[PDB]
Design a protein around this nucleic acid. Structure first.
Lengths: 106, 115
RNA sequence: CGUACACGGUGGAUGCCCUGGCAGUCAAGGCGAUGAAGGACGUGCUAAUCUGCGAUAAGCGUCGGUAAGGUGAUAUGAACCGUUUAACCGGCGAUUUCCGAAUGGGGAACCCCGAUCAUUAUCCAAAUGAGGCGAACCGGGGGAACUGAAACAUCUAAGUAC
RNA sequence: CCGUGAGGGAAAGGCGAAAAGAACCCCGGCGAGGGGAGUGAAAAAGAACCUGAAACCGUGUACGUACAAGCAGUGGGAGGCACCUUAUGCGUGUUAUGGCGUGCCUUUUGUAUAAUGGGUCAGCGACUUAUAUUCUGUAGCAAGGUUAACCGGGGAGCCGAA
RNA sequence: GCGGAAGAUGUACGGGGCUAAACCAUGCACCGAAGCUGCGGCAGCGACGUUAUGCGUUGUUGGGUAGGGGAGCGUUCUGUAGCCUGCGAAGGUGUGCUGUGAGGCAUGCUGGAGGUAUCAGAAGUGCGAAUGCUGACAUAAGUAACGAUAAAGCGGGUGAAAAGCCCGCUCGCCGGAAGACCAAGGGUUCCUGUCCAACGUUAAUCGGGGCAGGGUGAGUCGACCCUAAGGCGAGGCCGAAA
RNA sequence: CGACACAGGUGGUCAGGUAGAGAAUACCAGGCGCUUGAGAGAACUCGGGUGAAGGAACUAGGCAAAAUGGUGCCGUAACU
């Protein structure tokens, strides 16, 4: 399944996405349980909901469904007024990223 | 008022395109493209051409590397060539008496004869 | 990690459109002590804005027009109005709080009276005037300097700016 | 929105023929979102929603690549790998190795230059009016020629004619 | 040829190196430029003949900063003649072909509404290059920065989630004070309930955050009243008057 | 108020709450924990303590630091 507007950073995304791009879906669940990176959740509530809807709908066996291709490239950037520095105003060019994951049978 | 049009923004590419043999930048950028190809056009304003009359220092000094193995060389090899027969021009020649252990002698027994 | 491209994104250019501007032309042209212009506060069942009114408050009356639908911009929910012909568009009359030229006096809109000058004068303010506003045009007075003279004291900019 | 105040002062346009604006179901902490599905000619229109580029981001593809020396090419000859929508011993992508190669702009007698300017991008960004005079090229007609205000007429008047 | 000749992080003719690949007197044969010769091709200028910038012949041959002279492609819109398009245009991306070139043209995809050619005009007409203006963006970096009222810790409660929400205990801080009552000033930020997308330089089931309601009931408190320095308006007096 | 939940600035009353000369430290009352975290026993820098013997030899200058420092008795110079 795919995702959209994520408060993620796109950069700190595709960091946790990696390591969980290879084969074995189970190998994608054990890992990602401990990441110490905000970039673990969200990117996990996917590639989990991806393995799901992959079982029912798009018939497939969980025993042989692996992670083939997982990439994260999305936006958009929105004008934000985050108060940095003692006193000043600045617009954040913060971007986002969608966690698209396709876990079919390999 | 007048919309820039198919000029400028139509001038960035139509350049940056032609660079099949580009550089790190000066292919990604236009403020390097132009001043990069400026050397181009010139630099060889009318020189590739340089090749001939350049590496031609050979095909004359190799021709003796062809001879000087079956008699004399250079001096009297291209002087007996314009003696008997239609006299074959020396271009492909002086490059043939190297990549083939034949035909090279097919211009040594021609010379040294009718000498 | 270098470059090109592909898919997606970012970004917003470009192309097209535009209920806006810019410019010219014709017509028409003043408003206020029967207290205006402007502003404030209110007013719609719910309404915060804008608009309209103003406590008979997005309205009331008359005539004519118009027309069967309508209850402003908002196409919500409820409800209601209209053929005892409304909505909507045009003359005349009524009403028209307080301050404001206000003018009794004081005052950052709040509390008590024709204030001030002046004419007539039954000298009683009794009968009247002035005291404000308005895009820039006409008239009557006061009147520079930077600047030009490649310096500057006539002159010049000026009889302009004010 | 800024300044005590006088005053100063932005940016932001477009869903679709119709909204006809995503019913129903799965997922989720969730009217968020995702999947599936529905509408329509098209949503690769789902709401700062037409089209949607460049700088640029991620991924992926082609090809390099941790002994390698630097404008990063030209010509020659060898290596390969990869692709036969332009069949013909004819090309591309990138590239190993080798021979050469000190960005680009002003000032200055001389700048690659330890002379100045620019981080990059897109958009923006600098000889124009009447009149008069003097030449030139082209064109019409020729001691005559042209009118101005105002009337398709005018000749005032101007220049030329010793 | 030698003595005279002493210096600065490792000493040499370009280097290897050489007794001749030294030096001097002669000599022979070669290598070696866009020079000279020669074939083809483009041009320009000038000369001769000419209506000719058409041919024929001839000369130089044809480098250029400042500067002078001359021709041209492309763009916008308004004319005449004349065409293309949803059996799909303009634009955009990639690619093929042509021209010395400016530039023109075709194919595929996308797009999805208009767009041209000729001749004659009209033009706010074609740009890399001002510590230039405005907006956007990359590298720099995921790098520099968080401290006297230096205070939290151990259990427990609630919760999907609790290091900082709440309970208990333990342990501390402040004392003219982080205590109590008020002026000025600010002004609903107060209380309750429901939440959290935004705010709280982490999190939050918490909030002075978001939403909806609720709250500030004096004759003797204060205002209200008065006056001080001083100010204003009216009469009087001065080119004129605010 | 200072553009900020800016260790800055801002008037009055409570100066008898308990131990000292006193409106000086410790502690009731009352208020508060609203001045970012986790793991080895470096160099270097910010504050500070202690340093043998000499002791201003440092320095423009003893700057800095330190010494003396409560109370009672005795006693107290030049100069004015």
């Amino acid at each position: 399944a795919k995702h959209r507007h994520a408060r993620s950073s796109a950069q700190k995304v595709r960091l946790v996405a990696d390591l969980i791009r290879g084969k074995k879906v189970s190998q994608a669940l054990d890992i990602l349980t401990y990441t110490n990176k905000k970039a673990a959740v969200l990117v996990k509530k996917v590639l989990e909901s991806a393995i799901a809807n992959a079982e029912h709908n798009d018939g497939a066996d969980i025993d042989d469904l692996k992670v083939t291709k997982i990439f994260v490239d999305e936006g958009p950037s929105m004008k934000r007024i985050m108060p940095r520095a003692k006193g000043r105003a600045d617009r954040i060019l913060k971007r986002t990223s969608h966690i698209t994951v396709v876990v079919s049978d390999r | 008022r007048v919309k820039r049009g198919v000029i400028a923004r139509a001038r960035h590419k139509k350049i940056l395109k032609q660079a099949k043999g580009y550089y790190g930048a000066r292919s990604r950028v236009y403020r390097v493209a132009f001043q990069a190809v400026i050397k181009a056009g010139q630099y060889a304003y009318r020189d590739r051409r340089q090749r001939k009359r350049q590496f031609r220092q050979l095909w004359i000094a190799r021709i003796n590397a062809a001879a000087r193995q079956n008699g004399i060389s250079y001096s009297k090899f291209i002087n007996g060539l314009k003696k008997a027969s239609v006299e074959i021009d020396r271009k492909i020649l002086a490059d043939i008496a190297v990549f083939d252990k034949v035909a090279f002698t097919a211009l040594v027994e021609k010379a040294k004869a009718a000498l």
